Design a protein around this ligand. Structure first.
Ligand SMILES: [Ca+2]
Ligand SMILES: [Ca+2]
Lengths: 267, 267, 268, 267, 267, 268
């Protein structure tokens, strides 16, 4: 029985211009790297968890002369889909809105329930996950631009130690019994790996042919690293440092090539 | 910060012939992978530790006809030289002796002292390390034959949470500031990477030539995996599984080739 | 006997940092570290032990209008562990505090009741002698080089074991220095860098073997000026420098034939 | 003056065939190196001792197919003759019997009497010595084969601090006023120095001729070291390591040569 | 846990003429023979020590009509260098001065700290050593001449018994893990071994050639012994008795000879 | 704020003097004078004013048998007036005390309640800044060089006006120094003498114009040792000295063609 209390960096908050609503959601399970960078790592060694305390804090990093609004909401059951309308968010159990340049906390309620830590995709969200967090942004007069970050302050109890869950993520991960460090999106012959959280990582891309795929490319600011590429027996070894959520690795293969293979290790 | 109790596998025990004692030692430190395969991982998230309970147990697995002595000893002064004489060993602070067919437990005494956990070789062993364990054997009928294993039972309390440590080991680490997953051995153009403990690993070997080094080879029963080799820009991606301590990855290079680079990740 | 002092001192001047990538700065808390205890360091020279009873870092803004940016402070009591390199790493520290550029914030470092030896040299065991390390981080600003605010340390220490005065000059004791850590070196092959820890007036002397020995040294940094007296005969340089901000650098490159150079630093 | 508790190695135990008992004895005295290898050293700094706890434990190391009896006995009258008969042995004050595969402990009783520790043979055994221990074996299938070792567990309190005793042994000591590290045996021109216990020693042999004696030779498994020999002014400097009791240094001399001189230092 | 109280002879005090200051320093660690002749020997069997009481007593052995002054000082941390100016000594934590013909005590302060007994040169003085003693002499009107001696009166507690540290000192002692009985100083082809403390010793000098080195010579009063020399295979066996600190063994080799070898045993 | 300190320090070691002619030694009482305030001088560096409330000089003998000799102490509050040269002159001082070699004696210097500025440099008005001058005198001994006793200063001072740290290095400011008076020079035509005021570890650097400039410097005194690094190319000397008693001397002789040499002194 291990009790942890810490305030970690959850995500960066960028402004939203326009009129159509913009949403970002999370989930809340200690297995989720996107939410608990460090905690997820400790979580690999326990079967259960119980949250004693939980608060999401919005910490502005912009001037007082900044327009815009930031809203946070929480939902009891992770199985329900996030809101897709500004009305839905508001009909949600709890929500808080604040001016972009003003700090504000969302203190999430806690049941005494102790539950299993999710093992795979086929697990029941209602039984294994805690809830879901939602962020919304509007009223800014400048596109993507950081205005603040939100930190997660928690106190959860890990228990029932067990064998260490798997630490690497692979292309052929059956039932996603592995962690989710990166999420892929395929657009024809172009492949995109989106690094879910900030951190140090190592990704290995492998191919069949030889022309296979072109040397991969790093998309977005806040991502740097070393890309070791070798055409013959298409292979790339990328040692990256993502200093922000959602950075991108882009690889383009030949129509000749079969879908690419990859693994991600935590550095 | 909380406590943790588990009994992990430490090492297998092979026979030794003759009246002349054969030794093995381990320095007790939470970041020493060799002693705490699982725990070492957890330990990379705290600055201090305090062991409250620690006992080493020898568990036989051999036939009752075996001959031989198996003895355990502990010295709380990790900086002092390991014994060399049979008397040297028995003159240690605390020791226990038994026959190969008979189980025995060495229950180590504890100081209530809380201490910083080692960041690198250069930290003072007397300030950071708990002590040293010593295995001694002799009098067996035949050499390298397994006769039992020894497990480590503990209860330690981690504290002073902090920034996560280096999780990967590279061929150019700052005075052992990274975990020691593997220990290199060189004699000419032949390189050996001794894998410290049982587990799942991924090792990457790089060169700088074309024929720099030949496809690497696996030594020892209980080591297996895939060795993905490519001569052009000498590179090998070995995804291994080791069911026993001290297994070996052997790689030979061209007299022309520069000394190799390697990195080892936890799988 | 033993003395107890309390004082506030300027720790640093904060410059803006551009983009999403964090910039870091760190300080090791030790009574003889001039970077942190300008005046106290002198006094500290006459005792063997110290105990900190109160310690706080304050950030005070110098801007108030349209200035965006994050300013964060963190502390780590394991003075020998590596400094952070990642936004994540930093926030995972034992204690940290965040703020926006135009809003003041304080970091109160927790204190243990431990009395410890004051560091006599670069080879002392940091875990035994140093109190901890302080870390500043900045990123997210629009303008590159502008002063945004200042950092102050407010302390209360107790000096205690009296002895003969310690060495006041730092000298290259063939890998590792000898006295107060005025400068920290880093060798990069044939090139040598001496990082002058704190702002001040200093005098450094570099020596060699071979007459060709090393090239005339160079000053790297916006806040380092001085007079360099080079003599390529018996390889020697006498530099009287003026650092007006922490971390400036003195660069020297030697001949592959030349042995590792030696040096000394006097406090003017 | 303070107390001390330790369990030291006493001797190895070899088999004995036949129905006729084979014996071994040891006189319990803190300066008797044979019984207290380490302690004997400490003991050279006090004038008195008092044993509060003493137990001899036999620890097997043989296969369960071995045949044979192993028995231990104690007699608090060190001056009395050791037994010769099997009944003689079992009629002793306290004894314990066991089989070669089975561990057993002889727990010796204690008088609270505090006594002077022996300075030399001439001191009255009844006034100075604690008693005598006896090992007996018989019924084994084959002769000199090791079957276990016996350790000595004690708790004694030293007192009446004084001037340190002689630490070296010379070939011309005043009625055993020096430690007995070695015991000489002579038959003609052949000299044997039996090394009493396991340990590190340095023996020096001197002659008085030119060819006085040949380079000395080492007898027994578990004895090793350097023998630095020089014929002109017959001299040998042997730095040995003995991993077992009763090892032998053998030196042969010229019929002309005078009986040799030797000195033995602790290493 | 052994508690010792004894008053042993620390050193001889000789007069100092002239005007330039004269200093002598010690250190204070039970491993230091120079300070604890007998105690150092017992200390070889324990890992830790704690000083309960400590006083240095100056005991004059000269007439009342003797001019001169004697001063003693102590420093908390053994890492700091001894004073090199009369001002430094005086700025020291504690100091006491007395007339040469008058007895005087220096009672050193004690922390409750229990620390490890130094194991080698690479140990941390601040963590493992107790402090440092300094002696100064001046105002005498006759050169080297004994005027008194200083005795050390202590009460320290030895604890955490372990395997016996090494007892001999050798030329090739790596990291000085051995005791320091003698300190060498080389002046070209002349070698000097300075016997640190009074006591009985045995030193063995060995060479390569044959002319190797001339029969060694004893320098200083208060040193006598037997020197057994043999030219062929340069070897010397010296059984000495130093009745005072700093006596000297002098050996001169040929330019032909390589640096000499030697070991020192405690007699 | 302001601090008050009390401490006893070794002032000097007394050697016997032969004959009827007196030997003299003097000290100028000033908080930044290392000769008198070894440890305090460092602290004094952080204030502007001081006030002495208690001051005593003690002579303690080191002999007791057949040692003849007079030992006398005197004080003068006019720190700028010349030191005595005559037995008479000395005894005509404001306050003096006499004793025989084997008998201890104390001199208690009277105190005024004046708070004054601490001397920032060699050109400060002694009457305004210095407290006074102490004088030792000896003569009448039978043996020439033997230590006869020691001198100690026992004081209680109040430091008070806090400011930025003062200069710690002394530099030849073209006739008259700049910082603490570590050394006092006297030019005798083409020869220059630097008298090192107090025992300690020091580093001195001498420079010139003409390549021939000046001869390699010499150490004058029984208690001065060190390493001199001479380079007759660009006339320069780098001396790392060790004075183990007050008043040792560094001698340098220059070319008649050479301009007055310049120098600096660092405290190690
Ligand atoms: Ca110190
Ligand atoms: Ca001023």
């Amino acid at each position: 029985s291990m009790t942890m209390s810490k305030t970690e960096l959850l995500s960066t908050v960028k402004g939203t211009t326009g009129v159509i609503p913009s949403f970002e959601d999370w989930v809340v399970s200690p297995r989720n790297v996107a939410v608990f960078p460090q905690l997820s790592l400790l979580a690999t060694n326990f079967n259960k968890y119980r949250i004693t305390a939980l608060t999401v804090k919005y910490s502005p990093a912009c001037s007082f002369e900044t327009n815009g609004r930031v809203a946070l909401g929480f939902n009891d059951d992770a199985s329900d889909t996030p809101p897709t309308t500004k009305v839905g968010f508001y009909d949600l159990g709890k929500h808080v809105e604040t001016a972009a340049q003003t700090a504000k906390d969302l203190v999430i309620p806690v049941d005494g329930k102790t539950r299993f830590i999710r093992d795979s995709a086929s697990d029941d969200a209602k039984l294994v996950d805690f809830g879901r967090i939602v962020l919304s942004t509007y009223g800014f007069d400048k596109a993507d631009t950081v205005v603040g970050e939100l930190f997660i302050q928690y106190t959860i109890v890990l228990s029932d130690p067990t064998k260490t869950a798997k630490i690497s993520q692979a292309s052929n991960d059956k039932v996603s019994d592995g962690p989710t460090y990166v999420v892929p999106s395929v657009n024809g012959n172009e492949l995109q790996l989106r690094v879910v959280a900030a951190g140090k990582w190592c990704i290995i891309v492998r191919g069949t042919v030889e022309g296979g795929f072109t040397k991969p490319t790093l998309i977005g600011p806040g991502i740097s690293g070393d890309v070791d590429y070798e055409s013959a027996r298409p292979i790339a070894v990328c040692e990256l440092v993502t200093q922000m959520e959602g950075q991108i690795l882009k690889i383009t293969k030949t129509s000749a090539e079969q879908p690419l293979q990859w693994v991600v290790y935590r550095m």
